[PDB]
Amino acid sequence: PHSHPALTPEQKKELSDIAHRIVAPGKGILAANESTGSIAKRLQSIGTENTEENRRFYRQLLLTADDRVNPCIGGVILFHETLYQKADDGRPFPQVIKSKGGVVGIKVDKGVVPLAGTNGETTTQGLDGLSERCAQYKKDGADFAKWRCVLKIGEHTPSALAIMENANVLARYASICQQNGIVPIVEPEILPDGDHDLKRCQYVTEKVLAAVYKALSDHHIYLEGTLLKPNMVTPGHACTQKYSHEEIAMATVTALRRTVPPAVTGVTFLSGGQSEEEASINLNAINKCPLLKPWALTFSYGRALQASALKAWGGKKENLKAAQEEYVKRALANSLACQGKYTPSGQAGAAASESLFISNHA
Amino acid sequence: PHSHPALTPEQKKELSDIAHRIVAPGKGILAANESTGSIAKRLQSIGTENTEENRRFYRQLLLTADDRVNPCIGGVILFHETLYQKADDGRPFPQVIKSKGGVVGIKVDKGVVPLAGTNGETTTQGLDGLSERCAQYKKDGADFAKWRCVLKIGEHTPSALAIMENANVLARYASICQQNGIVPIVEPEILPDGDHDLKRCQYVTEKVLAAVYKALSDHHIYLEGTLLKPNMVTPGHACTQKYSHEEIAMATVTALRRTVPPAVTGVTFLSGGQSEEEASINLNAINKCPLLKPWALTFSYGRALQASALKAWGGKKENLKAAQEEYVKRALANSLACQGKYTPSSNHAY
Amino acid sequence: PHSHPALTPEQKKELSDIAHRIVAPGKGILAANESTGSIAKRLQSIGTENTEENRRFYRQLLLTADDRVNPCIGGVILFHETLYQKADDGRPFPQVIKSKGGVVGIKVDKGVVPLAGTNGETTTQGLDGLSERCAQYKKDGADFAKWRCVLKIGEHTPSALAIMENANVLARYASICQQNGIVPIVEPEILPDGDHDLKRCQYVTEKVLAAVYKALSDHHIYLEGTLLKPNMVTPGHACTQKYSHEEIAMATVTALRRTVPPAVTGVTFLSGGQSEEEASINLNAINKCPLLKPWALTFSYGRALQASALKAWGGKKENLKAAQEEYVKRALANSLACQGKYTPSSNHAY
Amino acid sequence: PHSHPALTPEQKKELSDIAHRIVAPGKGILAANESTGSIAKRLQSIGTENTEENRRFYRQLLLTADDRVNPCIGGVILFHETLYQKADDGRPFPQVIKSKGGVVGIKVDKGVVPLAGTNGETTTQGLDGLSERCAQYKKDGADFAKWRCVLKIGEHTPSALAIMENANVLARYASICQQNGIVPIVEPEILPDGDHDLKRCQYVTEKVLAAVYKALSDHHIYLEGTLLKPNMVTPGHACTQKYSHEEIAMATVTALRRTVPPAVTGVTFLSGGQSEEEASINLNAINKCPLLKPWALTFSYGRALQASALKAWGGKKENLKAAQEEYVKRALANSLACQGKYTPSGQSNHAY
């Protein structure tokens, strides 16, 4: 019951200042850390070879959009490869991101692994030598990190074991990050897979988050120097009953109010299969919910920000302008949504309404 | 996991409404639930025989203070005996309390008991037949309850066992209360005894509250239908280092912000033996602290509201008026305090 | 962590000695602690009024059987009422029990209560004032106590909350008993109700017992001064698949080997609705299981020891000898069973 | 509340047979898994250059001792490098180990790392890619593994976080091993450093082992297919009070009886810095303790088996025989001790 300060006042100030800059009013996160195995399917959809140059070019396309995205993007998450690549003008991507007022993030987990004795459940690995990697990434320009755990709703899931194990490992990952001046984004994703309804997702989300913050407390984590990346509370993808955006918003904010301490600097929602438009409309409704919310409620989207741009590009170099324009459109929209000032209008492509849901392959 | 609704929409509405009424803006709680045993020493200090009549008169004196206290008192905690007594005019005390706009509370725990194998630590008893008692109390005018758990800061305390057992028994007590329409006030008091500093109190408070809310979650407690009664964060009574009210306020608000969910309707601070003036000044600083507070921050005082009144009374019925005047002044003072409008005359460092 | 001895070497020796005497080779326990409301149906089955005198007579009938039962009975559990009744010769029942070489036990729990937010799950109450009660029972002749927690196998049960809460309350009960020189018998019964199979009962039984002993550790419980009363591992009462006695024995012993520390003095199995013969045959197979068992494996039966005697009696004083004869028959059968000497006439698959 | 079998009957039988063979009556384990950095200190103590060939020669010296050690050694733990080395005749070391009746073991953890917010406490890393590593080692001749967690007795240690985290990681390691047919040896070592007495060590050992087995249960670990490598229960090194071997044995067996389920196949004690003779006398006393012990109580020594051999060798090829003789003597002495038949010649429980 004795205190052995894990961080110093200076270390706390550095972590808190970083977390606040990432989720400053009107700002959100662009999750462009897709691996080669993942980005491959993306490039394939538009019939493009999955080469290092193509991946480089595509990342450059998103990172070098006009200055209209500056007020919209507070942070950009990159994959190891991209952190060490450069734009056509020789500027390292981390430098390109910062020159536009954004903070650089890096994925540090090494994927999910199966939990023996469970019904298809998993935990995440990547703690080995994480300290040394964080210290090096910090030097190379990164200020925050990404780590994803995955849970699923079923007849016997998520189980007591899965919840406890995933909560404990997130805490370890957060502790090591903070020791190296890196803001950890805690990500306990609850998949939308299944036919459960809204209230069931809310119940599970509440139990999961209560377990996550108890674990963070046991591990002496500095919450002001962290961010939370949860799933919005929605019905199952196969649920028959329909709900409005106001209901999803109310269920989501209620779950958070019952589990997330005010000390947490911000919440950056994951789209999880929602369409570009659907993701923006819900984020907006959440920010308009009548209930009191002591934390920033913004975005951290991957495909929900790139869908239209990826299609507009098509792998054709002469379509750069068209591609970037679609990206900019979604950034501005979400910027307004994280402020509760978004109202969808006329020119909203069909690709923006397409469901980006993919059944969890396992 | 699978949900088995512990409460219906109607039941939740009831508990939430009661909780909000108690901690409404500018309002607090008067803790007058002392037992014959715990009130003994006090009547002794003013040379007054400890008889039911004298107790009834004293309680009457506090509950019948003039209307100036109405906007100050949102709740009143009574001891079993008092819940069934009447004022001179024949009105049941619960009725007197309600007519002045206050909510009636009742003490339901049965005291602390020693935890074998610990360095003098305890847990609290009172769960047996608690359901039937809450239903009976509800029928007789009570809408919220009090249950006190006690922890101590020492070389090896509070231990892992004490923190875990006290947090678990508090959840059981809360569960039973919510099934009978009674708002449970969770009170995990960490004594100020000792020579520890301010940062050590903050550390222990953070760990305790964290354990408390995890246990409330495991037991499916409806937070919006509860209140929290914690100790303020301060140095031990024997600490040689000095701190300002602003530092006490910052440490207190920071600790709560790191553990108490926004859904909790309100926080009613225990006085923990502080003087009337000290408990008021500190509550004021807490409400003026810059940090954002998603819950009401008010009072739930015992001696911090009765001290001067008990003295002015001294058992003399002729002192009624003088005694009530003292109580009215502390009620007004704390009402301004819980709003940050009272005046007697680097957060990264936490 | 730091040590703060809950017991002295003398207190430990007293508890260990008591525990060993109860489960001495060939000895078991007679569970005759049925309440008025529980023995009511037992008496109406034989058209006998449920009066204090009839209950006193029936208990006397069992407690005063001839010396043939002495070597078979190491302990007898009584209900409050019976602990203060006397046989026709004026002798207090606790004296009658001790005079035959048996240890006296007393039921101390206060029944189950519903756990809010669960699918009909419960926990057990009775801790309030338990310390004073144990001190009094000790003076009146009791050396061990009984406390029953109930768990059920279902689609979503037993839940994480039920397991944790029941395990925790059993630990509080055990701690209080040992502080008063009373040997606590830890009873986490998993009902056989349902259509689940043998493997499912073994799984749940394994998870519950692990939680029970982690709890007893956290609360500093002296295991040598305790006994365990669990359910045998069997298929659900309505399971379609059928199993042999050897299978039941293997599932039961394997489950116990994976969770019960060798320090535990003994295991006294509950009958759980099994017939008199069935309960004896299963206990016999358990003792013949070709695996190492570091603890005594005996019995603590209620109806599985009284069924025939109760019927033979039929409420007629003229059938005293006949009734006791039936009791002696089951006492001898189980005495042989707990030794693997009873005759009515690939463990990696677990 | 539902079961989803992590292992099949065939997988359980395999893990169980391996565990029993390792701790069969009269047999123990030789821990020769020192790393390059660790072995450096050992070689430097005898003025010998720390080269691979020198390490190979030394490991060979122990692995090729005469057949007298056969009934004494049930298992041999190796470091990665040694698992892929060969004897002079060209035979792989794991082949040499098996031909002499021993089971081959491999160290799989990746060392300790500091736990932030604690008073110098740590946890252990090494889970990343562990499943692939175990499958590869199994194929190459390994049947059991080693993973070491370290806890320390102090003013505020072991803390709740340290105990909980170390117990959890050990369970993760055990789970992955069993999925690959490798028997995991759970090693929660409590350091003997400090001036604490016998009672304090027993208390701490009891609380640690309780958390360890609760964690193994939560992760669905098959106990019959595991072994435990705990510290003996002794006073701290700086403890002023003196104790007999009988008191050390009683406190050790008492702590184990109160926490280790009888389903555990065996207990292989670590020497924890004790002298060669001390570790043998205590192991013998532990086996003679007048209490019921439902599991095999044997050894898993490093320096308590190599101390004299390393010195007798001195790094000189001409001293091979003299060096091997020293090793054999300790192997024979401990073989008797884990049976309670040890002798210098060569042939109140309530107070705890």
CB-based burial of residue A89 (10 Å sphere; 0-12 exposed, 13-18 middle, 19+ buried)? exposed
Token code pair at residue A359: 């059944």
| B213 and chain A in contact, CB less than 8 A | yes
Q: Nearest 5°: CA angle at B316, between B312 and B321?
A: 55
The region that residue D315 occupies, defined by phi over 0 for left and psi between -120 and 50 for alpha, beta otherwise, is left
| B259 and chain A in contact, CB less than 8 A | yes
Q: Residue A158 and residue B1: Cβ atoms within 8 Å?
A: yes
Helix axes B276-288, B303-313, angle to 10 degrees: 150
* A140 vs A176: CA distance, rounded Å: 18
CA-nearest residue to C161 within chain B is: B218
* C285 vs C307: CA distance, rounded Å: 22
Among candidates B2, B262, B348 on the partner chain, residue whose Cβ is nearest the Cβ of A294: B262
Q: Are B230 and B188 in contact (CB under 8 A)?
A: yes
CA-nearest residue to A211 within chain B is: B214
Q: Nearest 5°: CA angle at B104, between B103 and B110?
A: 140
C152 is catalytic: no
Token code pair at residue A198: 């809204």
Which residue type, as a one-letter code, is found at position D341? K
Residue with tokens 């559990």: C77
CATH class of A1-362: alpha beta
Q: Cα dist. B165→A334, C180, C218, D259, D326 in Å?
A: 46, 21, 10, 22, 55
Q: Is D302 labelled a binding residue?
A: no
Q: Say if residue C230 is preceded by a cis peptide, omega within 30 of 0.
A: no
Q: 3-class DSSP state for residue D329?
A: helix
Residues 6+ apart with CB under 8 A from D24: D74
Among candidates A3, A200, A294 on the partner chain, residue whose Cβ is nearest the Cβ of B200: A3
| C217 and chain B in contact, CB less than 8 A | no
Q: Residue D9 and residue C346: Cβ atoms within 8 Å?
A: yes
Do β-strands A122-124 and B296-301 pair in parallel, antiparallel, or remain unpaired?
Answer: unpaired
Count CB neighbours of B26 within 10 A. 17
Q: Are A167 and A211 in contact (CB under 8 A)?
A: yes
* A264 vs C218: CA distance, rounded Å: 32
CA-nearest residue to D206 within chain C is: C217
Which residue type, as a one-letter code, is found at position C201? C
| C203 and chain D in contact, CB less than 8 A | yes
- Enter the DSSP assignment of C236: -
* A348 vs A281: CA distance, rounded Å: 13
Beta partners for residue A227, in sequence order: A185, A266
Which residue type, as a one-letter code, is found at position D69? V
Q: 3-class DSSP state for residue B184?
A: strand
Residues 6+ apart with CB under 8 A from A345: none
Q: Is D273 labelled a binding residue?
A: yes
Q: Residue B262 and residue A263: Cβ atoms within 8 Å?
A: no
Q: Cα dist. A101→A11, A21, A76, D10 in Å?
A: 22, 9, 10, 60
Token code pair at residue D230: 């705990």
Gapped junctions in chain D, after residues (C–N > 2.5 Å): 347
CA-nearest residue to B163 within chain A is: A1
Q: Which residues in chain D have their CB less than 8 angstroms from residue C12's CB?
A: 350
* D153 vs D195: CA distance, rounded Å: 9
Q: Where are the alpha helices (DSSP H) in C147-197?
A: 160-179
- CATH number of B1-350, picked from 3.40.50.12640, 2.40.110.10, 3.20.20.70, 3.10.20.90: 3.20.20.70
CB-based burial of residue A332 (10 Å sphere; 0-12 exposed, 13-18 middle, 19+ buried)? middle
CA-nearest residue to C220 within chain B is: B117
* A149 vs A211: CA distance, rounded Å: 13
Count CB neighbours of C161 within 10 A. 19
Token code pair at residue B309: 């009144």
Radius of gyration of chain D, Cα coordinates, nearest whole angstrom: 20
Q: How far is A298 from chain B (nearest CA, A)?
A: 18
CA pseudo-torsion sign A330, A331, A332, A338? positive
* C252 vs C248: CA distance, rounded Å: 6
Query: Cα–chain-centroid distance for residue B84?
Result: 21
* D29 vs D32: CA distance, rounded Å: 9
Element (H, E) at C190: strand C183-190
Residues 6+ apart with CB under 8 A from C309: C61, C62, C323, C324, C326, C327, C330
Residue with tokens 């049965």: B110
Q: Which residues in chain B have their CB less than 8 angstroms from residue C5's CB?
A: 117
* B159 vs B120: CA distance, rounded Å: 11
Q: Are C263 and C223 in contact (CB under 8 A)?
A: yes
- Enter the DSSP assignment of B331: H
* B144 vs B75: CA distance, rounded Å: 9
* C297 vs C291: CA distance, rounded Å: 13
Q: Residue D128 and residue A131: Cβ atoms within 8 Å?
A: no
Do β-strands B266-269 and C183-190 pair in parallel, antiparallel, or remain unpaired?
Answer: unpaired
Token code pair at residue C297: 């494996």
Q: 3-class DSSP state for residue C58?
A: helix
Q: Cα dist. C273→B171, C35, C112, C266, C276 in Å?
A: 34, 17, 19, 22, 9
| C258 and chain B in contact, CB less than 8 A | no
Residue with tokens 């028994």: B169
The residue among B95, B99, B74 whose CA lies nearest residue B86 is B95
- Enter the DSSP assignment of D191: E
Token code pair at residue B13: 């509405």
Q: 3-class DSSP state for residue C184?
A: strand
Residues 6+ apart with CB under 8 A from B143: B18, B103, B104, B105, B181, B182, B183
Subunits with 3+ C-beta pairs closer than 8 A to C? B, D
Q: Which residues in chain C have their CB less than 8 angstroms from residue B117's CB?
A: 4-6, 175, 219-220
Token code pair at residue A31: 């999750």
Token code pair at residue C6: 């809950």
Residue with tokens 């045959």: C281
Q: Is C272 labelled a binding residue?
A: yes
Token code pair at residue B280: 């008021």
DSSP string, B64-81: T--GGGTTTEEEEEE-HH
- Enter the DSSP assignment of A147: E
Burial code (b: 16+ CB inside 10 Å, e: under 16) for A299-326 equals bbbbbbbbbbbbbbbebeeebeeebbbb
- Enter the DSSP assignment of D270: B
Q: Cα dist. D92→A344, B5, D97 in Å?
A: 71, 64, 9
| D341 and chain C in contact, CB less than 8 A | no
Q: Which CATH number applies to D1-352?
A: 3.20.20.70
Residue with tokens 């005063």: C64
**Cα dihedral B63, B69, B71, B75 in deg (nearest 10):** -30
Q: In chain D, what is the greatest distance between 2 CA atoms, to the nearest angstrom?
A: 64
* B308 vs B321: CA distance, rounded Å: 13
Q: Are D148 and D187 in contact (CB under 8 A)?
A: yes
Q: Where are the alpha helices (DSSP H) in chain A?
A: 9-22, 36-45, 52-63, 80-83, 93-98, 130-139, 160-178, 198-218, 245-257, 276-288, 303-313, 320-337
Beta partners for residue B295, in sequence order: none
Q: Residue C292 and residue D260: Cβ atoms within 8 Å?
A: no
* Residues of D designated catalytic: 187, 229
Beta partners for residue B189, in sequence order: B150
Domain ranges of chain C: 1-350
The residue among A84, A90, A80 whose CA lies nearest residue A36 is A80
Q: In chain A, what is the greatest distance between 2 CA atoms, to the nearest angstrom?
A: 64
Q: Are C234 and C244 in contact (CB under 8 A)?
A: no
Radius of gyration of chain B, Cα coordinates, nearest whole angstrom: 19
Q: Residue D217 and residue C206: Cβ atoms within 8 Å?
A: yes
Which residue type, as a one-letter code, is found at position A12? K
Subunits with 3+ C-beta pairs closer than 8 A to A? B, D
Burial code (b: 16+ CB inside 10 Å, e: under 16) for B175-200 equals bbbbbbbbbbbbbbbbbbebebbbbb
Element (H, E) at C213: helix C198-218
Q: Are D241 and D201 in contact (CB under 8 A)?
A: no
**Side-chain half-sphere CA neighbours of B71 within 13 A:** 8
CB-based burial of residue D53 (10 Å sphere; 0-12 exposed, 13-18 middle, 19+ buried)? exposed
Q: Are B204 and A1 in contact (CB under 8 A)?
A: yes
DSSP string, C77-119: EE-HHHHT-B-TTS-BHHHHHHHTTPEEEEE----EEE-TTSS
Residue with tokens 């003398």: C10
DSSP string, D111-178: -EEE-TTSSS-EEE---TTHHHHHHHHHHTT--EEEEEEEEE-SSS-S-HHHHHHHHHHHHHHHHHHH
Q: Which residues in chain B have their CB less than 8 angstroms from residue A16's CB?
A: 348
Which residue positions of A form the known binding site for beta-D-fructose 1,6-bisphosphate? Answer: 42, 271-273, 300, 303
| C259 and chain D in contact, CB less than 8 A | yes
Considering only residues 87 to 146 of chain D, which have any Cβ-Cβ distance to chain A shorter than 8 Å? 110, 113, 115-119, 123, 125-129, 131
- Can you give the length of chain B in residues? 350
Q: Which residues in chain A have their CB less than 8 angstroms from residue B2's CB?
A: 203
Do β-strands B296-301 and B266-269 pair in parallel, antiparallel, or remain unpaired?
Answer: parallel
The region that residue B228 occupies, defined by phi over 0 for left and psi between -120 and 50 for alpha, beta otherwise, is beta
* D342 vs A185: CA distance, rounded Å: 58
| A158 and chain B in contact, CB less than 8 A | yes
Token code pair at residue A283: 């984020």
Beta partners for residue A144, in sequence order: A105, A183
- Choose, from C121, C229, C276, C326, the residue flagged as catalytic: C229
| C311 and chain B in contact, CB less than 8 A | no
